[PDB]
Design a protein around this motif. Structure first.
Motif, PDB file in Angstrom:
ATOM      1  N   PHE B  20       0.857  -1.186   0.000  1.00 36.15           N
ATOM      2  CA  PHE B  20       0.000   0.000   0.000  1.00 36.15           C
ATOM      3  C   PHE B  20       0.893   1.236   0.000  1.00 36.15           C
ATOM      4  O   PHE B  20       0.610   2.217  -0.671  1.00 36.15           O
ATOM      5  CB  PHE B  20      -1.019  -0.010   1.124  1.00 36.15           C
ATOM      6  CG  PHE B  20      -1.609   1.319   1.419  1.00 36.15           C
ATOM      7  CD1 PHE B  20      -2.410   1.952   0.494  1.00 36.15           C
ATOM      8  CD2 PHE B  20      -1.371   1.929   2.626  1.00 36.15           C
ATOM      9  CE1 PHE B  20      -2.946   3.188   0.760  1.00 36.15           C
ATOM     10  CE2 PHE B  20      -1.914   3.159   2.907  1.00 36.15           C
ATOM     11  CZ  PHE B  20      -2.702   3.792   1.973  1.00 36.15           C
ATOM     12  N   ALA B  21       2.001   1.194   0.704  1.00 33.93           N
ATOM     13  CA  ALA B  21       2.919   2.276   0.672  1.00 33.93           C
ATOM     14  C   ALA B  21       3.547   2.488  -0.721  1.00 33.93           C
ATOM     15  O   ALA B  21       3.401   3.574  -1.236  1.00 33.93           O
ATOM     16  CB  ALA B  21       3.943   2.029   1.720  1.00 33.93           C
ATOM     17  N   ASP B  23       3.660   2.945  -4.188  1.00 31.35           N
ATOM     18  CA  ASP B  23       2.684   3.215  -5.112  1.00 31.35           C
ATOM     19  C   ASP B  23       3.725   3.877  -5.840  1.00 31.35           C
ATOM     20  O   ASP B  23       4.847   3.925  -5.391  1.00 31.35           O
ATOM     21  CB  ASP B  23       1.694   4.104  -4.390  1.00 31.35           C
ATOM     22  CG  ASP B  23       2.038   5.534  -4.407  1.00 31.35           C
ATOM     23  OD1 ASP B  23       2.594   6.002  -3.397  1.00 31.35           O
ATOM     24  OD2 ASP B  23       1.694   6.203  -5.400  1.00 31.35           O
ATOM     25  N   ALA B  93     -10.603   7.667  -0.214  1.00 32.34           N
ATOM     26  CA  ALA B  93     -10.027   6.477  -0.827  1.00 32.34           C
ATOM     27  C   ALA B  93     -10.785   6.076  -2.084  1.00 32.34           C
ATOM     28  O   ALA B  93     -10.201   5.486  -3.001  1.00 32.34           O
ATOM     29  CB  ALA B  93     -10.008   5.322   0.174  1.00 32.34           C
ATOM     30  N   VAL B  96      -9.676   8.613  -4.827  1.00 32.17           N
ATOM     31  CA  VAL B  96      -8.306   8.320  -5.229  1.00 32.17           C
ATOM     32  C   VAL B  96      -8.231   7.083  -6.117  1.00 32.17           C
ATOM     33  O   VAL B  96      -7.529   7.096  -7.134  1.00 32.17           O
ATOM     34  CB  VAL B  96      -7.385   8.176  -4.007  1.00 32.17           C
ATOM     35  CG1 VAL B  96      -6.017   7.661  -4.431  1.00 32.17           C
ATOM     36  CG2 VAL B  96      -7.250   9.514  -3.287  1.00 32.17           C
ATOM     37  N   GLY B  97      -8.956   6.023  -5.771  1.00 33.04           N
ATOM     38  CA  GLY B  97      -8.998   4.840  -6.605  1.00 33.04           C
ATOM     39  C   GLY B  97      -9.689   5.105  -7.925  1.00 33.04           C
ATOM     40  O   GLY B  97      -9.514   4.354  -8.888  1.00 33.04           O
ATOM     41  N   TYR B  99      -8.970   7.545  -9.913  1.00 33.98           N
ATOM     42  CA  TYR B  99      -7.967   7.919 -10.906  1.00 33.98           C
ATOM     43  C   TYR B  99      -6.756   6.994 -10.856  1.00 33.98           C
ATOM     44  O   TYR B  99      -5.970   6.945 -11.810  1.00 33.98           O
ATOM     45  CB  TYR B  99      -7.543   9.378 -10.715  1.00 33.98           C
ATOM     46  CG  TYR B  99      -6.600   9.621  -9.557  1.00 33.98           C
ATOM     47  CD1 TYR B  99      -5.221   9.549  -9.728  1.00 33.98           C
ATOM     48  CD2 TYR B  99      -7.087   9.940  -8.299  1.00 33.98           C
ATOM     49  CE1 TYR B  99      -4.359   9.772  -8.675  1.00 33.98           C
ATOM     50  CE2 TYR B  99      -6.230  10.167  -7.241  1.00 33.98           C
ATOM     51  CZ  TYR B  99      -4.869  10.079  -7.433  1.00 33.98           C
ATOM     52  OH  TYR B  99      -4.014  10.305  -6.380  1.00 33.98           O
ATOM     53  N   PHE B 265       2.083  11.713   1.940  1.00 34.38           N
ATOM     54  CA  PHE B 265       1.383  11.053   0.846  1.00 34.38           C
ATOM     55  C   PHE B 265       2.054   9.765   0.389  1.00 34.38           C
ATOM     56  O   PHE B 265       1.497   9.072  -0.470  1.00 34.38           O
ATOM     57  CB  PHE B 265       1.241  12.009  -0.342  1.00 34.38           C
ATOM     58  CG  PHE B 265       0.203  13.076  -0.140  1.00 34.38           C
ATOM     59  CD1 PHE B 265      -1.128  12.827  -0.429  1.00 34.38           C
ATOM     60  CD2 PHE B 265       0.557  14.326   0.339  1.00 34.38           C
ATOM     61  CE1 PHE B 265      -2.087  13.805  -0.244  1.00 34.38           C
ATOM     62  CE2 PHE B 265      -0.396  15.308   0.526  1.00 34.38           C
ATOM     63  CZ  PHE B 265      -1.719  15.047   0.234  1.00 34.38           C
ATOM     64  N   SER B 266       3.226   9.423   0.927  1.00 30.83           N
ATOM     65  CA  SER B 266       3.878   8.168   0.592  1.00 30.83           C
ATOM     66  C   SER B 266       3.763   7.114   1.683  1.00 30.83           C
ATOM     67  O   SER B 266       3.771   5.920   1.366  1.00 30.83           O
ATOM     68  CB  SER B 266       5.362   8.409   0.276  1.00 30.83           C
ATOM     69  OG  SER B 266       6.011   9.075   1.345  1.00 30.83           O
ATOM     70  N   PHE B 271      -5.259   7.336   5.937  1.00 32.97           N
ATOM     71  CA  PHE B 271      -6.217   6.633   5.102  1.00 32.97           C
ATOM     72  C   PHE B 271      -6.788   5.428   5.842  1.00 32.97           C
ATOM     73  O   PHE B 271      -6.197   4.908   6.793  1.00 32.97           O
ATOM     74  CB  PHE B 271      -5.566   6.183   3.794  1.00 32.97           C
ATOM     75  CG  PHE B 271      -5.046   7.314   2.953  1.00 32.97           C
ATOM     76  CD1 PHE B 271      -5.862   7.937   2.024  1.00 32.97           C
ATOM     77  CD2 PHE B 271      -3.741   7.754   3.091  1.00 32.97           C
ATOM     78  CE1 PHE B 271      -5.387   8.978   1.249  1.00 32.97           C
ATOM     79  CE2 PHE B 271      -3.258   8.794   2.320  1.00 32.97           C
ATOM     80  CZ  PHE B 271      -4.082   9.407   1.398  1.00 32.97           C
ATOM     81  N   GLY B 371      -6.680   0.235  -1.268  1.00 33.48           N
ATOM     82  CA  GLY B 371      -7.646   1.318  -1.196  1.00 33.48           C
ATOM     83  C   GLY B 371      -9.081   0.842  -1.319  1.00 33.48           C
ATOM     84  O   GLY B 371      -9.974   1.354  -0.641  1.00 33.48           O
ATOM     85  N   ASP B 421      -7.284  14.212  -8.270  1.00 29.13           N
ATOM     86  CA  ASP B 421      -6.146  13.849  -7.434  1.00 29.13           C
ATOM     87  C   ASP B 421      -5.743  15.004  -6.528  1.00 29.13           C
ATOM     88  O   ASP B 421      -5.882  14.921  -5.302  1.00 29.13           O
ATOM     89  CB  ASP B 421      -4.969  13.415  -8.308  1.00 29.13           C
ATOM     90  CG  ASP B 421      -3.651  13.416  -7.553  1.00 29.13           C
ATOM     91  OD1 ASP B 421      -3.507  12.623  -6.600  1.00 29.13           O
ATOM     92  OD2 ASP B 421      -2.760  14.214  -7.912  1.00 29.13           O
ATOM     93  N   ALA B 425      -7.498  14.456  -2.908  1.00 31.97           N
ATOM     94  CA  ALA B 425      -6.470  13.858  -2.069  1.00 31.97           C
ATOM     95  C   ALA B 425      -5.895  14.886  -1.106  1.00 31.97           C
ATOM     96  O   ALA B 425      -6.119  14.795   0.107  1.00 31.97           O
ATOM     97  CB  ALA B 425      -5.368  13.251  -2.939  1.00 31.97           C
TER      98      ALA B 425
HETATM   99  C1  LIG Z   1       1.109   5.913  -1.315  1.00 35.23           C
HETATM  100  N1  LIG Z   1       0.046   5.598  -0.387  1.00 35.23           N
HETATM  101  C2  LIG Z   1      -1.051   5.040  -1.134  1.00 35.23           C
HETATM  102  C3  LIG Z   1      -1.134   5.752  -2.473  1.00 35.23           C
HETATM  103  C4  LIG Z   1      -2.575   6.064  -2.838  1.00 35.23           C
HETATM  104  O1  LIG Z   1      -3.402   5.496  -1.869  1.00 35.23           O
HETATM  105  C5  LIG Z   1      -4.676   5.155  -2.322  1.00 35.23           C
HETATM  106  C6  LIG Z   1      -4.835   4.685  -3.605  1.00 35.23           C
HETATM  107  C7  LIG Z   1      -6.086   4.350  -4.071  1.00 35.23           C
HETATM  108  C8  LIG Z   1      -7.177   4.484  -3.245  1.00 35.23           C
HETATM  109  C9  LIG Z   1      -7.019   4.955  -1.962  1.00 35.23           C
HETATM  110  C10 LIG Z   1      -5.769   5.294  -1.494  1.00 35.23           C
HETATM  111  C11 LIG Z   1      -5.619   5.816  -0.069  1.00 35.23           C
HETATM  112  C12 LIG Z   1      -2.752   7.578  -2.881  1.00 35.23           C
HETATM  113  C13 LIG Z   1      -2.472   8.258  -4.044  1.00 35.23           C
HETATM  114  C14 LIG Z   1      -2.631   9.625  -4.094  1.00 35.23           C
HETATM  115  C15 LIG Z   1      -3.068  10.317  -2.982  1.00 35.23           C
HETATM  116  C16 LIG Z   1      -3.350   9.640  -1.816  1.00 35.23           C
HETATM  117  C17 LIG Z   1      -3.188   8.274  -1.769  1.00 35.23           C
END
Ligand code: A1LX4
Ligand code: A1LX4
Ligand code: CL
Ligand code: CL
Ligand code: NA
Lengths: 565, 565
Positions: B20-21, B23, B93, B96-97, B99, B265-266, B271, B371, B421, B425
Motif C-alpha cells: 500500500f505504501a 505506489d 479512498a 483516489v482509486g 484515478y 502522501f507516501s 487513510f 484502497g 487527485d 487527495a
Molecule cells: C502511497 N500511499 C497510497 C497511495 C494512494 O493510496 C490510495 C490509492 C487508491 C485508493 C485509496 C488510497 C488511499 C494515494 C495516491 C494519491 C493520494 C493519496 C493516496
C-alpha cells in the motif's frame, strides 16, 4: 406490514388517471397526426384501435392491479417467469421521466419569462435570446416571407428564443459535444424536482389532492383558449381543415400504423402507472366503468385540444397569408415556437402566454408525478425496506432523476432527449406490453382473469373482451413491435445527423431491457430447486398455487387451459 | 455475527502494508523532489518529519485498529462526534482509486505494447501513435539540438506516444470538451477492475496471497534495473547529483513543505487502508515493530528507487549530451516517457520494458487493492448488511469505480484526473488526518490510548510518542493544512489553463467532505435525546461508556483529562 392505503375516493383515482393519460402528447402529436393522416378520416382508425386495443389494455391493467394488490413488479406473482417485465416497465418509466422533467423545466422557464410586459419572442433584438443575425426578421411586421416552412424556419424570433436563450443550442455540436448544463435550466429543473418531491414524499393522499388542480386547470385553460380562438379570424379555415374527411388516405399503411401508435402512446397502457393507481383501490371497485371513462375523456380531450390548436394554426395562416400545411407543426416546436408566436400577436399576450404555460406545466407535472409514483410503488412492493422508508426513497429517486437529467439540460440535450425518448420509450415499452399481454393471456389464462373479475365485480367480462385479451391485443402489440423493428430509421435531427454509435447506444439500452427480462426468467429457472418439469411448474403457476406442484396437477400443462377462450 | 477474519500470518500484513505504501509516488516523485530540494540535504527534513509525524501516525492508526477490531468509519465508537471522518476517508479512498485505476490501465496498455519486436517509442512514425503533423524528430539520433526543459519536449516519439496513441490528447481541448472514453483504454480498465474483483471478492485471504507477488516482484525489478544501470555510462554522474549535499537550500522554506508532503502522501497515514489492515490482526500483535519496519522499508525503497531512476536519468543525459537538470522529470511523464525512452536505447529493450511495466502494474494493483479493501471494510463494519453480501458489494464498488473512471480515460481525461487527485487527495485527506489526530489526542485523550496499548502490548508508549501524538503531529498537520490553503494556486496543465469553474468544483468536493464530517457531528448532536450537556456527554464519550452519562462523571469535562500528557 400495514395494508395498502387506498385513495380518498374514486374521484382522486379518476383525476390521477386522467392527468396521466392527458399530457403534452395529446396536445402536440394528436392534432398534427390527425390532419396529416387523412384529416377527419383519422378518427375512424383511432376508434378502431381504441375499441379493440388500449381499452383491453386498460381494463386488464386495472383489474390486475385491483385483484392482485401489488405494484407493477410484484403483480407478477401469478406467473413469476414475468417479473422481469415488471422491472422493465419500472426502468422505462424512469427513463421517460428522465427527459420529461426537462420539458417540464422548459415550460417553467417559459412561464417565468412570460411575466415580462414585452414578451421575449416578440422582439428579435436580443430579448432573452441570442440573435444569430442571420435574417433576424419579424414574423410579419418587418418583412413577409414563408418560402419553405414555418416549423423548420429557425430565424423567426419565436424559434430563435427556443434555439438560443433557453436551450443554448448554438454552443453545441451534437452527441459528441453536448457541453455543460445551463444554470437557468438547472435551477428550473431543481424547482421542478423539489415540487415533485414535496408532492410525492407524503404518499398517495397528497398526490390525490394535487391531481385535483392539475386536472381541473388544463381543461379550463383549453376551454378559454378555444372560446377566444373561435372568434379570431382564420379559425374557421383551420377547423374545416382539421375535420376534413378523406377515405382515400386509409388505403395506405401510414395512417394504419400512426393511429395505433398514437392510441398506444396516449392512453398510457402497459406502464406501471395504471397498475400503481389501481393498487390503492377497493377490492369491489368497478374497473370497467373507470377504464372506459378514462379513455373516453382522453380521446375527447385530444379532440378538443386539436380543435383549438388548429384554430390557432388557421389564425396564424390567415395573419401570415399562408396555407395550413405551412403552419403545421408537432411536438416541442408546436408547444414552444408556433403557439407562443400566435399568443404574441393576440391582444393581452401576457395573460394568454401565462395561462398557456401554466397549463403545460400542470400537464407535465401530473404525468411526472404519476410515473415517479409508479416507479416508487413498483420498487417498494418488491423490496419492502424502501416502502417503510418512503421519504428517503423518494428523495433518492428525485435526486437521481435530476442528476441523470443534467445531461439533457446542457447546451445540446435535445439530441439525447430524442435518442432516449424514441429508443427507450418506443421499443422497450412495446416489448414490455407484448410480453405482458402474451404472459397474462396465455400462461394465466383469460378464464382465470374472468373469474378474478367476477370475484371483484358481480358481472363477468363478455366474450368480446376475452377475445380482445386473448388474440386481438397480443397480435396487435406484436404487429406494432414488428413495424417498429422493420420500419426503424437512423436517428436524425432538423439539421444534424446522429453519430453512428448513438443508434448503437439506443439499441444497447433496448437489448439491456430485453435481456433483463430474460435475465429474470433465467434467474427463476436456476434459483428454483428441481428439474426440467419441476421448475417450469413453479415458473408458470402462481406463488400461492405452489403447493399443488408436488401433487402433479398443473393446469397450464393441460391443453384445455390454452384452448379455453 | 461471526468474528472478524484474521490474517494468515504477520508476513501477509507486512507485505500488504509495504505494498500500500509503494505506489509509484515513491519512484516518480521522491527522486525529483530530493534533487530539486537541496540535492542530498533533502533526507534530513524527510527523516525528521518521518520520525516526528509519520511513524507516530502509523503507530496510532495500527494500535487503534488493532484495539477496536472495526472498520475505518466504525473505529470512532470511542467518540461518536468524529465518526464522520470515517466516511470522509472512505470517500477520499474512493476518489483516489477513481484515478489510480486509470494509471494502472495506462501501465497495462504499455505492457501489451512492449510485446513487440520494434517498440513504438523506439522510432518515429505511425507506430501505435498519431503524428502531430509536425515532423517527429528522433530523440537524439537525428538532431541533438534541444532546450533546457526536456520534460516539456512534446515532439519526441516517447512523449508523442503517450500523448496520442494512449491518451489521445490531440482530439480534446480541456474539461469543457472531454469526448468519449477510448475503446482500448476501456478494455484495459475493464481487465484491471476484473483482476481487482477476482482478487478482492473472497476476502483478506486471497489478498494475503496476492500481496506476496505484488510486493516481491517490484523489489526484484528495481534490483535488476539498478544492477544493469550502474554499469551503464553516465550513472556515476547521476548518482553524485542525487547524493550531492547542499545545506544552503535548507532555509529556502520550500524543502520542509515538500518533504512533509512526500512523507505524508507516501506513508499512507490517515487513510482507511491502515485501519482496515490492522483490524484483522491479533489483539497481542506488536504494532510498534510493524509501524517502524513499514516506514523504514518505505524510505529505503524510495531511496533505492531514486538511485536507479537518477542512474537512468544520468545515462540519458550522457547519451543526449545534456545536463542532469534537463532530463529532470517527475510523475506520469517520468514513468511513461523518459524511462521507456531510456529502455529503448538499451540493448534488448523488450525485456526491460516488459519487466518495468510489470513492476508498475504490480505497484498500482497492490495500492488499488488496499484502497478498495479499505472502503469495503469501512462500509461493511458500519452497515453489516453489506458485510454479509461481500461479493455483491465488491462487484458494485468495482463497477461504480469503473463507471466514474470512464470520465478519466477519455481524450481529455488527464485534466479531470489531475483535478480530482490534487484537490480531493490533498485537502480532503489533510482535513481528515487533522480531525483524526485531534479526536484521538485531545478528545479521546492520550491516556486512554496508552492504557489500551498497555492491554495490547506489555510495554507502554514512551513520553516521546505521547508528545508526538498530542502536540507534534496535530500541529504538523495543522501547519500542512494552512500551507496548502494559503499557497493554493489555480489549476493548470503544461499548456492548457483550467477554467474558473474547475477550481469551483474542486473546492466544492472539498467543502462536501468538510461539511459531511460536520454533518455527522450535527446528526449526533440532534439524534441524541437530552439537554446540551447530556448530548455532549454521549458525543464525547465512548459507546460502551454511555452508561456513566447519567452518573454525572464525565472525564473529558474535567481539566485533568486535557491537562495530561
Ligand atoms: C502511497 N500511499 C497510497 C497511495 C494512494 O493510496 C490510495 C490509492 C487508491 C485508493 C485509496 C488510497 C488511499 C494515494 C495516491 C494519491 C493520494 C493519496 C493516496
Ligand atoms: C400519455 N401517458 C403517458 C405519458 C408519459 O408517461 C410518463 C411520463 C413521465 C414519466 C413516466 C411516464 C410513464 C409518456 C410520454 C412519452 C412516452 C412514454 C410515456
Ligand atoms: Cl391520443
Ligand atoms: Cl515518500
Ligand atoms: Na395530467
Amino acid at each position: 406490514a400495514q395494508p395498502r392505503e387506498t385513495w380518498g375516493k374514486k374521484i382522486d383515482f379518476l383525476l390521477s388517471v386522467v392527468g396521466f393519460a392527458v399530457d403534452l402528447a395529446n396536445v402536440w402529436r394528436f392534432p398534427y397526426l390527425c390532419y396529416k393522416n387523412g384529416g377527419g378520416a383519422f378518427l375512424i382508425p383511432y376508434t378502431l384501435f381504441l375499441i379493440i386495443a388500449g381499452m383491453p389494455l386498460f381494463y386488464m391493467e386495472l383489474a390486475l392491479g385491483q385483484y392482485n394488490r401489488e405494484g407493477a413488479a410484484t403483480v407478477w406473482k401469478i406467473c413469476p417467469f414475468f417479473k422481469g417485465v415488471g422491472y422493465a416497465v419500472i426502468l422505462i418509466a424512469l427513463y421517460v421521466g428522465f427527459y420529461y422533467n426537462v420539458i417540464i423545466a422548459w415550460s417553467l422557464y417559459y412561464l417565468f419569462s412570460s411575466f415580462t410586459l414585452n414578451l421575449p419572442w416578440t422582439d428579435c433584438g436580443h430579448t432573452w435570446n441570442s440573435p444569430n443575425c442571420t435574417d433576424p426578421k419579424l414574423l410579419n411586421g418587418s418583412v413577409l416571407g414563408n418560402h419553405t416552412k414555418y416549423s423548420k424556419y429557425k430565424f423567426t424570433p419565436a424559434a430563435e428564443f427556443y434555439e438560443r436563450g433557453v436551450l443554448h443550442l448554438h454552443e453545441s455540436s451534437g452527441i459528441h459535444d453536448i457541453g455543460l448544463p445551463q444554470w437557468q435550466l438547472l435551477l428550473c429543473l431543481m424547482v421542478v424536482v423539489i415540487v415533485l418531491y414535496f408532492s410525492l414524499w407524503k404518499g398517495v393522499k397528497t398526490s390525490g389532492k394535487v391531481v385535483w388542480i392539475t386536472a381541473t386547470l388544463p381543461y379550463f385553460v383549453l376551454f378559454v383558449l378555444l372560446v377566444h380562438g373561435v372568434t379570431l379570424p382564420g379559425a374557421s379555415n383551420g377547423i374545416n381543415a382539421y375535420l376534413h374527411i378523406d377515405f382515400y388516405r386509409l388505403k395506405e399503411a401510414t395512417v394504419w400504423i400512426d393511429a395505433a401508435t398514437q392510441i398506444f402512446f396516449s392512453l398510457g397502457a402497459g406502464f406501471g402507472v395504471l397498475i400503481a393507481f389501481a393498487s390503492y383501490n377497493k377490492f369491489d371497485n368497478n374497473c370497467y366503468r373507470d377504464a372506459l371513462l378514462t379513455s373516453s375523456i382522453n380521446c375527447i380531450t385530444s379532440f378538443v385540444s386539436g380543435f383549438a390548436i388548429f384554430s390557432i394554426l388557421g389564425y396564424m395562416a390567415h395573419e401570415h397569408k399562408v396555407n395550413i400545411e405551412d403552419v403545421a407543426t408537432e411536438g416541442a416546436g408546436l408547444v414552444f415556437i408556433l403557439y407562443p408566436e400566435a399568443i404574441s400577436t393576440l391582444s393581452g399576450s401576457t395573460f394568454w402566454a401565462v395561462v398557456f404555460f401554466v397549463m403545460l406545466l400542470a400537464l407535465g407535472l401530473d404525468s411526472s408525478m404519476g410515473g415517479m409514483e409508479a416507479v416508487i410503488t413498483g420498487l417498494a412492493d418488491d423490496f419492502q425496506v424502501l416502502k417503510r422508508h418512503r421519504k428517503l426513497f423518494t428523495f433518492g429517486v428525485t435526486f437521481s432523476t435530476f442528476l441523470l437529467a443534467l445531461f439533457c439540460i446542457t447546451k445540446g440535450g435535445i439530441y439525447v432527449l430524442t435518442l432516449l425518448d424514441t429508443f427507450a420509450a418506443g421499443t422497450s415499452i412495446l416489448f414490455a406490453v407484448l410480453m405482458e399481454a402474451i404472459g397474462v393471456s396465455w400462461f394465466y389464462g383469460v378464464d382465470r382473469f374472468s373469474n378474478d373479475i367476477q370475484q371483484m365485480m358481480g358481472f363477468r367480462p363478455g366474450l368480446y373482451w376475452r377475445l380482445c385479451w386473448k388474440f386481438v391485443s397480443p397480435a396487435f402489440l406484436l404487429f406494432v413491435v414488428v413495424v417498429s423493428i422493420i420500419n426503424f430509421k437512423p436517428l436524425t435531427y432538423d439539421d444534424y445527423i446522429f453519430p453512428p454509435w448513438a443508434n448503437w447506444v439506443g439499441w444497447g439500452i433496448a437489448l439491456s431491457s430485453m435481456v433483463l427480462v430474460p435475465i429474470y426468467v433465467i434467474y427463476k429457472f436456476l434459483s428454483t430447486q428441481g428439474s426440467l418439469w419441476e421448475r417450469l411448474a413453479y415458473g408458470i403457476t402462481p406463488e400461492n398455487e405452489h403447493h399443488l406442484v408436488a401433487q402433479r396437477d398443473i393446469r397450464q400443462f393441460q391443453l384445455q387451459h390454452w384452448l379455453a377462450i
